[PDB]
RNA sequence: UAAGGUGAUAUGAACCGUUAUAACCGGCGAUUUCCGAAUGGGGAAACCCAGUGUGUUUCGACACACUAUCAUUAACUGAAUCCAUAGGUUAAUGAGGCGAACCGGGGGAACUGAAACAUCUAAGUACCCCGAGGAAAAGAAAUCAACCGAGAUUCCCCCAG
RNA sequence: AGGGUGACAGCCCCGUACACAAAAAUGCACAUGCUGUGAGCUCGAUGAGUAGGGCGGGACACGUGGUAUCCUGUCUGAAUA
RNA sequence: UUUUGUAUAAUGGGUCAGCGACUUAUAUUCUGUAGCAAGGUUAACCGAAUAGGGGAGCCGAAGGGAAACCGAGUCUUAACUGGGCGUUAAGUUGCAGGGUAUAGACCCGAAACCCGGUGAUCUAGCCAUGGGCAGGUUGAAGGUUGGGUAACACUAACUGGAGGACCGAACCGACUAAUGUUGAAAAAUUAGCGGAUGACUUGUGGCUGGGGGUGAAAGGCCAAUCAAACCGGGAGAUAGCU
RNA sequence: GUUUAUUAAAAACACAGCACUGUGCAAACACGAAAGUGGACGUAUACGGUGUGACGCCUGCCCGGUGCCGGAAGGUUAAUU
RNA sequence: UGAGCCUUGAUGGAAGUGUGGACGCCAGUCUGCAUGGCUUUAAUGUUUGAUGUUCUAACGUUGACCCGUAAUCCGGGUUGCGGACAGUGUCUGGUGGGUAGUUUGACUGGGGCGGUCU
RNA sequence: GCUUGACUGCGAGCGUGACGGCGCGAGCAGGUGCGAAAGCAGGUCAUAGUGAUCCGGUGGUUCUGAAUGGAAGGGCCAUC
């Protein structure tokens, strides 16, 4: 499930569009990566499957806060 | 990515300065490895409140006994002296506890030789005023009265 | 409620009943095999095979009840790694499947029309997928107006082919 | 109104108009108890990887147009009455 | 019925009964008719419900100009002797009808295109595990032994028992003919025929699913069909043809 | 040997043999949006693709065209800036 | 290592016994080396891009081991090998009958070929 | 020889087309050339020498211009 654990980003659909303007179904999908984040608050490595962006979100908000959600929302981690 | 530092840390570090560091270096090494922290603003004060409650706080709490010599500005009672010799001139020296024998009942009592003037300590008249070790900065002022017996 | 009654093809038999337990109607309860979500395990549905606790003047064995999975919670346990975490057992709640349309969402055609055809259309239709209610959805302005003023959402008629 | 009864029935039967009914289980209303639950005032605070932007798409009757508005896969990224 | 034309040897119909094709909705115009008339008329909704209320609004009484704008005129042009379009005819709302527009739009009919299911009980290929091949030939390697060589070579008997080896039943195929062809049979019967220890043959079960499979490759096979299976659906696809 | 089950059994397919070509192993290749898997529990005396088609004697010239292989100058050339 | 800024030596405590580099108006004199009673020049500290080594700490491991776990999955952990490569998202140029949707006129003494089309 | 009538605005009234359209035209207004003048000239003896609509470009023009003033874009005349 190409799905960003932090941000909710899943794949989306659109068209392609030639010069001839031809519509053809396509998919956009999240730049996902799955990373080993160091918590320390847990002295452990939680490894989330993330989108660069999710990563930025973590880099901002803060890991302990992100992990806050998910748990807050039932998710594993 | 900005973040402020904890430990030294090369090409930037400074026990708490404000550096701007490449994304990865930080979320991958600087932290989750204690050596810095997201400049979360909540922090730029959290770690500036130091640069105030310190570098202007405990650098002023250094002035609580000016020159240490406060009310010793009228010379001290000459209990004994510091010695003499050579029938007129001088000859005998100050033991590793003998410039107190005179000022030997004023402030507090101690006994060590933080020698300050690495000379043969001039032998002449008697009453001099240099400084001696009173701390990491200031000094002191008193005199010396010989004994005629 | 009652003087008639034991559904029908479908008689007959043997019976029930007539002033209140015949029958008949309705409220509430009892019982409710097996299969089926099917849930002890299995399985070619309605069959096969267990385990654990129970129970028998005949306490072999054969009856009765529990034992699926998943989630939340708790208790007891408990690794690499000593603390922890993971893991494991148990217990209590809950879910699970079914089924009209209407509803919200994920995805989403082609014939066809353009008197061919690719932009365009058919259409966000058909269809598949998930979810929910009695309705759903939406909703109390970073809305419109236009220098006057309106004052959420929904629905209808005009505006206007 | 209607239906039936040996042919077409207001008065033969069942009904209809009308007026009546529940030991029970339930629905909705109110009035009350229970556990909750928070009410009013004063002083505050006022939604950031967000708005905006590049790219690619999508949605707006609007087919990138001179094209506002909205959503966002990708890269970025404010002000703070 | 179609045709320039059909007794026509061109189409359709064995016959009778029943059924079977220009419809409905909303717009829009015209005609007929009715009402009111420089006016006609209400929609939603309200309702005292076919009344009444509601005149939002629509159409009409004013055009010209792209427009600003002007206005019984106006536009053209600097302006037109002038030119064009206008001013001189009554609308409007029901009701019935004739056309059109959107809708399956008079009825029936494709070959197909798209979506979602069902199918390897026929067949193709593969996997697992099992079964089957009467009878009769040929007689490879190798081996023993004699003969033979300086020793090998070589040679004779014997022994052995290979092979997509031979002949031929079962079994598997299907080259020719005849019959049959409203069949005994939706692919056979009868006489002949190729293989028959193998790239053999066959039972049970399993796997591969539709632009997909499988194919010793014919476009072959995938349940009597296959240049794209069957079923349901889009669906009354479309049919300028009959 | 195979084949057009049902008008073609052949000179078509296949075959051992041969050649070219790709592949250093998490191979190439192939089913698959992926995970997983075949190749292969193999490893260049192997694996795939293509052609030829026992065996004998043999397989000449042509690299312009098309296809493919190699080329660290120059010209031309995308997003981006 | 291309270019900017900061600077300490160039354009804008005397005389004599002694030295590397040179547009030196063509024949100088210097720019420094020793001594002796805002614009044309060399290296530092830098700031900023390019190239190159190596590191480890993202990330890969279809090497070995530990545990969950009597397990050819998975997860965690340790170790080894790699390593900011590879790979993957977004954008972009090329290739791309592998797949797709289609087009490929009429007239015509039948059609096609030829011819013709205002 | 002198010139720019290969002029601008229009146009009674004809032709010829299903239509889109094409064609001929004296005359009026402004302005111009030639000629002493009467006068002739809105191309070429005539009849071929061509391409609708869309979209877009260029010049001109306040006609329009989504709160207002502007602007963008649209219209109109010329033209590609
Ligand atoms: Mg069971
Ligand atoms: Mg079961
Ligand atoms: Mg089509
Ligand atoms: Mg069409
Ligand atoms: Mg609700
Ligand atoms: Mg106001
Ligand atoms: Mg706010
Ligand atoms: Mg005829
Ligand atoms: Mg006749
Ligand atoms: Mg006839
Ligand atoms: Mg044989
Ligand atoms: Mg034989
Ligand atoms: Mg036979
Ligand atoms: Mg089978
Ligand atoms: Mg068949
Ligand atoms: Mg079908
Ligand atoms: Mg349809
Ligand atoms: Mg049809
Ligand atoms: Mg043969
Ligand atoms: Mg055949
Ligand atoms: Mg044959
Ligand atoms: Mg090979
Ligand atoms: Mg051949
Ligand atoms: Mg040959
Ligand atoms: Mg094609
Ligand atoms: Mg033709």
PDB file of N, CA and C (backbone and C1' of nucleotides) in Angstrom, chain E residues 66-69 76-84, chain H residues 9-12 27-30 63-64 74-76:
ATOM      1  P     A E  66     -24.038  47.190 -36.874  1.00  0.00           P
ATOM      2  O5'   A E  66     -23.650  45.982 -35.895  1.00  0.00           O
ATOM      3  C5'   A E  66     -24.072  45.950 -34.539  1.00  0.00           C
ATOM      4  C4'   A E  66     -23.015  45.398 -33.613  1.00  0.00           C
ATOM      5  C3'   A E  66     -22.960  46.077 -32.260  1.00  0.00           C
ATOM      6  O3'   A E  66     -23.880  45.509 -31.357  1.00  0.00           O
ATOM      7  C1'   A E  66     -20.780  46.025 -33.177  1.00  0.00           C
ATOM      8  P     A E  67     -25.016  46.443 -30.766  1.00  0.00           P
ATOM      9  O5'   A E  67     -24.160  47.445 -29.867  1.00  0.00           O
ATOM     10  C5'   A E  67     -23.509  46.821 -28.773  1.00  0.00           C
ATOM     11  C4'   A E  67     -22.489  47.735 -28.166  1.00  0.00           C
ATOM     12  C3'   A E  67     -23.046  49.022 -27.595  1.00  0.00           C
ATOM     13  O3'   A E  67     -23.415  48.854 -26.239  1.00  0.00           O
ATOM     14  C1'   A E  67     -21.195  49.496 -29.019  1.00  0.00           C
ATOM     15  P     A E  68     -24.465  49.896 -25.674  1.00  0.00           P
ATOM     16  O5'   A E  68     -23.626  51.253 -25.560  1.00  0.00           O
ATOM     17  C5'   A E  68     -22.631  51.299 -24.554  1.00  0.00           C
ATOM     18  C4'   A E  68     -21.917  52.626 -24.526  1.00  0.00           C
ATOM     19  C3'   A E  68     -22.813  53.855 -24.480  1.00  0.00           C
ATOM     20  O3'   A E  68     -23.198  54.164 -23.151  1.00  0.00           O
ATOM     21  C1'   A E  68     -21.195  54.110 -26.196  1.00  0.00           C
ATOM     22  P     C E  69     -24.647  54.670 -22.752  1.00  0.00           P
ATOM     23  O5'   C E  69     -25.156  55.396 -24.068  1.00  0.00           O
ATOM     24  C5'   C E  69     -24.604  56.670 -24.334  1.00  0.00           C
ATOM     25  C4'   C E  69     -24.911  57.096 -25.744  1.00  0.00           C
ATOM     26  C3'   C E  69     -26.347  57.507 -26.029  1.00  0.00           C
ATOM     27  O3'   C E  69     -26.597  58.851 -25.661  1.00  0.00           O
ATOM     28  C1'   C E  69     -25.641  55.982 -27.668  1.00  0.00           C
ATOM     29  P     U E  76     -22.430  54.591 -37.510  1.00  0.00           P
ATOM     30  O5'   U E  76     -22.689  54.233 -39.046  1.00  0.00           O
ATOM     31  C5'   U E  76     -21.671  53.590 -39.792  1.00  0.00           C
ATOM     32  C4'   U E  76     -21.978  53.606 -41.266  1.00  0.00           C
ATOM     33  C3'   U E  76     -21.331  54.715 -42.078  1.00  0.00           C
ATOM     34  O3'   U E  76     -19.996  54.409 -42.442  1.00  0.00           O
ATOM     35  C1'   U E  76     -23.606  54.625 -42.597  1.00  0.00           C
ATOM     36  P     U E  77     -18.810  54.774 -41.434  1.00  0.00           P
ATOM     37  O5'   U E  77     -18.324  56.172 -42.044  1.00  0.00           O
ATOM     38  C5'   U E  77     -18.100  56.280 -43.438  1.00  0.00           C
ATOM     39  C4'   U E  77     -18.267  57.696 -43.932  1.00  0.00           C
ATOM     40  C3'   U E  77     -17.857  58.823 -42.989  1.00  0.00           C
ATOM     41  O3'   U E  77     -16.454  59.044 -42.953  1.00  0.00           O
ATOM     42  C1'   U E  77     -19.953  59.309 -43.939  1.00  0.00           C
ATOM     43  P     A E  78     -15.716  59.876 -41.796  1.00  0.00           P
ATOM     44  O5'   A E  78     -16.469  61.284 -41.703  1.00  0.00           O
ATOM     45  C5'   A E  78     -16.331  62.120 -40.564  1.00  0.00           C
ATOM     46  C4'   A E  78     -16.743  63.540 -40.874  1.00  0.00           C
ATOM     47  C3'   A E  78     -18.169  63.727 -41.352  1.00  0.00           C
ATOM     48  O3'   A E  78     -19.093  63.777 -40.278  1.00  0.00           O
ATOM     49  C1'   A E  78     -16.711  64.896 -42.801  1.00  0.00           C
ATOM     50  P     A E  79     -20.369  62.828 -40.356  1.00  0.00           P
ATOM     51  O5'   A E  79     -21.124  63.446 -41.611  1.00  0.00           O
ATOM     52  C5'   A E  79     -21.501  64.799 -41.454  1.00  0.00           C
ATOM     53  C4'   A E  79     -22.194  65.330 -42.677  1.00  0.00           C
ATOM     54  C3'   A E  79     -23.269  64.432 -43.258  1.00  0.00           C
ATOM     55  O3'   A E  79     -24.489  64.490 -42.538  1.00  0.00           O
ATOM     56  C1'   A E  79     -21.858  65.217 -44.985  1.00  0.00           C
ATOM     57  P     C E  80     -25.480  63.242 -42.616  1.00  0.00           P
ATOM     58  O5'   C E  80     -26.195  63.633 -43.993  1.00  0.00           O
ATOM     59  C5'   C E  80     -26.539  62.716 -45.019  1.00  0.00           C
ATOM     60  C4'   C E  80     -26.023  63.219 -46.343  1.00  0.00           C
ATOM     61  C3'   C E  80     -26.924  62.966 -47.544  1.00  0.00           C
ATOM     62  O3'   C E  80     -27.443  64.194 -48.028  1.00  0.00           O
ATOM     63  C1'   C E  80     -24.625  62.381 -48.013  1.00  0.00           C
ATOM     64  P     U E  81     -28.656  65.119 -47.539  1.00  0.00           P
ATOM     65  O5'   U E  81     -29.096  65.596 -48.998  1.00  0.00           O
ATOM     66  C5'   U E  81     -29.150  64.566 -49.988  1.00  0.00           C
ATOM     67  C4'   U E  81     -29.495  65.099 -51.353  1.00  0.00           C
ATOM     68  C3'   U E  81     -30.345  64.190 -52.241  1.00  0.00           C
ATOM     69  O3'   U E  81     -31.750  64.439 -52.180  1.00  0.00           O
ATOM     70  C1'   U E  81     -28.364  64.838 -53.428  1.00  0.00           C
ATOM     71  P     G E  82     -32.708  63.233 -52.624  1.00  0.00           P
ATOM     72  O5'   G E  82     -32.652  62.137 -51.466  1.00  0.00           O
ATOM     73  C5'   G E  82     -31.473  61.874 -50.714  1.00  0.00           C
ATOM     74  C4'   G E  82     -30.583  60.790 -51.288  1.00  0.00           C
ATOM     75  C3'   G E  82     -30.903  59.327 -50.953  1.00  0.00           C
ATOM     76  O3'   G E  82     -31.818  58.707 -51.850  1.00  0.00           O
ATOM     77  C1'   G E  82     -28.623  59.776 -50.463  1.00  0.00           C
ATOM     78  P     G E  83     -32.384  57.200 -51.676  1.00  0.00           P
ATOM     79  O5'   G E  83     -31.042  56.362 -51.505  1.00  0.00           O
ATOM     80  C5'   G E  83     -31.203  54.956 -51.391  1.00  0.00           C
ATOM     81  C4'   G E  83     -29.947  54.332 -50.859  1.00  0.00           C
ATOM     82  C3'   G E  83     -30.132  53.350 -49.722  1.00  0.00           C
ATOM     83  O3'   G E  83     -30.503  52.069 -50.168  1.00  0.00           O
ATOM     84  C1'   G E  83     -28.507  54.891 -49.104  1.00  0.00           C
ATOM     85  P     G E  84     -32.014  51.612 -49.978  1.00  0.00           P
ATOM     86  O5'   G E  84     -31.875  50.721 -48.670  1.00  0.00           O
ATOM     87  C5'   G E  84     -30.878  49.725 -48.815  1.00  0.00           C
ATOM     88  C4'   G E  84     -30.300  49.337 -47.486  1.00  0.00           C
ATOM     89  C3'   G E  84     -31.322  48.878 -46.474  1.00  0.00           C
ATOM     90  O3'   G E  84     -31.774  47.564 -46.719  1.00  0.00           O
ATOM     91  C1'   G E  84     -29.764  50.333 -45.460  1.00  0.00           C
TER      92        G E  84
ATOM     93  P     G H   9     -13.711  53.864 -49.357  1.00  0.00           P
ATOM     94  O5'   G H   9     -14.874  54.885 -48.990  1.00  0.00           O
ATOM     95  C5'   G H   9     -14.877  55.376 -47.663  1.00  0.00           C
ATOM     96  C4'   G H   9     -15.916  56.449 -47.516  1.00  0.00           C
ATOM     97  C3'   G H   9     -17.335  56.012 -47.810  1.00  0.00           C
ATOM     98  O3'   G H   9     -17.934  55.401 -46.682  1.00  0.00           O
ATOM     99  C1'   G H   9     -16.870  58.035 -48.940  1.00  0.00           C
ATOM    100  P     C H  10     -19.095  54.312 -46.798  1.00  0.00           P
ATOM    101  O5'   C H  10     -20.039  55.036 -47.872  1.00  0.00           O
ATOM    102  C5'   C H  10     -20.661  54.354 -48.956  1.00  0.00           C
ATOM    103  C4'   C H  10     -21.432  55.330 -49.809  1.00  0.00           C
ATOM    104  C3'   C H  10     -22.489  54.787 -50.758  1.00  0.00           C
ATOM    105  O3'   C H  10     -23.690  54.409 -50.109  1.00  0.00           O
ATOM    106  C1'   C H  10     -21.253  56.519 -51.797  1.00  0.00           C
ATOM    107  P     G H  11     -24.640  53.236 -50.681  1.00  0.00           P
ATOM    108  O5'   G H  11     -25.162  53.789 -52.089  1.00  0.00           O
ATOM    109  C5'   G H  11     -25.733  55.079 -52.257  1.00  0.00           C
ATOM    110  C4'   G H  11     -25.978  55.364 -53.714  1.00  0.00           C
ATOM    111  C3'   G H  11     -26.431  54.168 -54.524  1.00  0.00           C
ATOM    112  O3'   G H  11     -27.844  54.081 -54.540  1.00  0.00           O
ATOM    113  C1'   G H  11     -24.556  55.192 -55.588  1.00  0.00           C
ATOM    114  P     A H  12     -28.613  52.829 -55.156  1.00  0.00           P
ATOM    115  O5'   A H  12     -29.457  53.477 -56.343  1.00  0.00           O
ATOM    116  C5'   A H  12     -30.695  54.049 -55.978  1.00  0.00           C
ATOM    117  C4'   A H  12     -31.150  55.039 -57.014  1.00  0.00           C
ATOM    118  C3'   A H  12     -31.834  54.452 -58.236  1.00  0.00           C
ATOM    119  O3'   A H  12     -33.203  54.207 -57.993  1.00  0.00           O
ATOM    120  C1'   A H  12     -30.174  55.954 -58.935  1.00  0.00           C
ATOM    121  P     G H  27     -21.675  61.200 -65.191  1.00  0.00           P
ATOM    122  O5'   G H  27     -22.508  61.442 -63.843  1.00  0.00           O
ATOM    123  C5'   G H  27     -23.759  62.116 -63.875  1.00  0.00           C
ATOM    124  C4'   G H  27     -24.544  61.970 -62.588  1.00  0.00           C
ATOM    125  C3'   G H  27     -23.868  62.500 -61.339  1.00  0.00           C
ATOM    126  O3'   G H  27     -24.105  63.875 -61.174  1.00  0.00           O
ATOM    127  C1'   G H  27     -24.705  60.333 -60.923  1.00  0.00           C
ATOM    128  P     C H  28     -22.982  64.864 -60.652  1.00  0.00           P
ATOM    129  O5'   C H  28     -23.106  64.703 -59.068  1.00  0.00           O
ATOM    130  C5'   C H  28     -24.257  65.228 -58.440  1.00  0.00           C
ATOM    131  C4'   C H  28     -24.306  64.846 -56.988  1.00  0.00           C
ATOM    132  C3'   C H  28     -23.131  65.296 -56.142  1.00  0.00           C
ATOM    133  O3'   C H  28     -23.197  66.646 -55.740  1.00  0.00           O
ATOM    134  C1'   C H  28     -23.529  63.029 -55.731  1.00  0.00           C
ATOM    135  P     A H  29     -21.848  67.457 -55.995  1.00  0.00           P
ATOM    136  O5'   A H  29     -21.044  67.028 -54.678  1.00  0.00           O
ATOM    137  C5'   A H  29     -21.670  67.186 -53.418  1.00  0.00           C
ATOM    138  C4'   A H  29     -20.831  66.625 -52.299  1.00  0.00           C
ATOM    139  C3'   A H  29     -19.358  67.002 -52.305  1.00  0.00           C
ATOM    140  O3'   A H  29     -19.114  68.332 -51.893  1.00  0.00           O
ATOM    141  C1'   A H  29     -19.577  64.717 -51.791  1.00  0.00           C
ATOM    142  P     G H  30     -17.851  69.141 -52.461  1.00  0.00           P
ATOM    143  O5'   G H  30     -16.584  68.391 -51.860  1.00  0.00           O
ATOM    144  C5'   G H  30     -16.398  68.496 -50.459  1.00  0.00           C
ATOM    145  C4'   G H  30     -15.254  67.636 -49.993  1.00  0.00           C
ATOM    146  C3'   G H  30     -13.914  67.929 -50.637  1.00  0.00           C
ATOM    147  O3'   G H  30     -13.266  69.036 -50.056  1.00  0.00           O
ATOM    148  C1'   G H  30     -14.278  65.620 -50.662  1.00  0.00           C
ATOM    149  P     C H  63     -14.607  56.632 -27.992  1.00  0.00           P
ATOM    150  O5'   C H  63     -15.427  55.269 -28.214  1.00  0.00           O
ATOM    151  C5'   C H  63     -16.836  55.258 -27.989  1.00  0.00           C
ATOM    152  C4'   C H  63     -17.454  53.876 -28.038  1.00  0.00           C
ATOM    153  C3'   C H  63     -17.260  52.993 -26.816  1.00  0.00           C
ATOM    154  O3'   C H  63     -18.217  53.282 -25.821  1.00  0.00           O
ATOM    155  C1'   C H  63     -16.853  51.737 -28.772  1.00  0.00           C
ATOM    156  P     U H  64     -17.792  53.442 -24.300  1.00  0.00           P
ATOM    157  O5'   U H  64     -17.613  51.930 -23.817  1.00  0.00           O
ATOM    158  C5'   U H  64     -18.753  51.089 -23.787  1.00  0.00           C
ATOM    159  C4'   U H  64     -18.372  49.631 -23.863  1.00  0.00           C
ATOM    160  C3'   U H  64     -17.646  49.050 -22.659  1.00  0.00           C
ATOM    161  O3'   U H  64     -18.551  48.641 -21.645  1.00  0.00           O
ATOM    162  C1'   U H  64     -16.567  48.376 -24.664  1.00  0.00           C
ATOM    163  P     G H  74      -8.719  39.776 -27.639  1.00  0.00           P
ATOM    164  O5'   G H  74     -10.209  40.318 -27.418  1.00  0.00           O
ATOM    165  C5'   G H  74     -11.261  39.400 -27.640  1.00  0.00           C
ATOM    166  C4'   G H  74     -12.599  40.028 -27.384  1.00  0.00           C
ATOM    167  C3'   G H  74     -13.129  40.957 -28.457  1.00  0.00           C
ATOM    168  O3'   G H  74     -13.607  40.285 -29.600  1.00  0.00           O
ATOM    169  C1'   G H  74     -13.423  41.980 -26.397  1.00  0.00           C
ATOM    170  P     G H  75     -12.993  40.769 -31.000  1.00  0.00           P
ATOM    171  O5'   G H  75     -14.016  41.985 -31.211  1.00  0.00           O
ATOM    172  C5'   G H  75     -15.345  41.858 -30.739  1.00  0.00           C
ATOM    173  C4'   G H  75     -16.161  43.077 -31.081  1.00  0.00           C
ATOM    174  C3'   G H  75     -15.932  43.692 -32.455  1.00  0.00           C
ATOM    175  O3'   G H  75     -16.741  43.114 -33.459  1.00  0.00           O
ATOM    176  C1'   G H  75     -15.785  45.372 -30.798  1.00  0.00           C
ATOM    177  P     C H  76     -16.341  43.279 -34.988  1.00  0.00           P
ATOM    178  O5'   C H  76     -16.111  44.847 -35.233  1.00  0.00           O
ATOM    179  C5'   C H  76     -17.239  45.666 -35.540  1.00  0.00           C
ATOM    180  C4'   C H  76     -16.884  47.117 -35.772  1.00  0.00           C
ATOM    181  C3'   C H  76     -15.884  47.369 -36.887  1.00  0.00           C
ATOM    182  O3'   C H  76     -16.527  47.581 -38.121  1.00  0.00           O
ATOM    183  C1'   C H  76     -15.176  48.479 -34.919  1.00  0.00           C
TER     184        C H  76
END
